[PDB]
Amino acid sequence: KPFLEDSKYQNLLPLFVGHNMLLVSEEPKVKEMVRILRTVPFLPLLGGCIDDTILSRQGFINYSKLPSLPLVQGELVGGLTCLTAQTHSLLQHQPLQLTTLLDQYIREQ
Amino acid sequence: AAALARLGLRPVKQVRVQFCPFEKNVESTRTFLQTVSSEKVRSTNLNCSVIADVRHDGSEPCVDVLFGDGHRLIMRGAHLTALEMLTAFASHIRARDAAGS
Amino acid sequence: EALAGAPLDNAPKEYPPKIQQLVQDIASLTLLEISDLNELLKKTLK
Amino acid sequence: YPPKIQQLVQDIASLTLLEISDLNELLKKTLK
Amino acid sequence: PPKIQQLVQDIASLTLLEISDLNELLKKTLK
Amino acid sequence: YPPKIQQLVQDIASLTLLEISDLNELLKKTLK
Amino acid sequence: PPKIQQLVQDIASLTLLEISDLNELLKKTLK
Amino acid sequence: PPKIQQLVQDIASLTLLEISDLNELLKKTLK
Question: What CATH number did the domain enclosing B75 receive?
Answer: 3.40.30.10
The amino acid at H30:
L
| Nearest-angstrom CA–CA distance, B43 and B94 | 18
Nearest chain A residue to F25 by CA distance is A88
Does residue B83 sit within a domain?
Answer: yes
Chains that touch B (3 or more CB pairs under 8 A): A, C
Structural domain of B40: 12-95
| Nearest-angstrom CA–CA distance, G11 and G21 | 12
- Determine whether the interchain pair D17/A51 forms a contact, defined as Cβ–Cβ distance below 8 Å: yes
Does residue B2 sit within a domain?
Answer: no
| Nearest-angstrom CA–CA distance, B86 and F10 | 81
Contact list, C31 vs chain E (CB under 8 Å): 4, 7-8
- Number of independent structural domains in chain B: 1
Looking at the complex, does the CB of residue E12 fall below 8 Å from at least one CB of chain F? no
Does residue B18 sit within a domain?
Answer: yes
- Determine whether the interchain pair D22/C15 forms a contact, defined as Cβ–Cβ distance below 8 Å: yes
Q: Are A56 and B56 in contact (CB under 8 A)?
A: yes
Could you tell me the resolution of this structure in angstroms?
A: 2.9
Whether B and D touch (3+ CB pairs < 8 Å), yes or no: no
| Nearest-angstrom CA–CA distance, A94 and F23 | 17
3-state secondary structure of A21: coil
Nearest chain E residue to C31 by CA distance is E8
Does residue B100 sit within a domain?
Answer: no
Does residue B27 sit within a domain?
Answer: yes
| Nearest-angstrom CA–CA distance, F5 and E19 | 12
Does residue B62 sit within a domain?
Answer: yes
Whether F and B touch (3+ CB pairs < 8 Å), yes or no: no
Does residue B7 sit within a domain?
Answer: no
| CA proximity to G1, closest of F13, H25, H4 | H25
Q: Are A55 and C6 in contact (CB under 8 A)?
A: yes
Does residue B68 sit within a domain?
Answer: yes
The amino acid at D32:
K
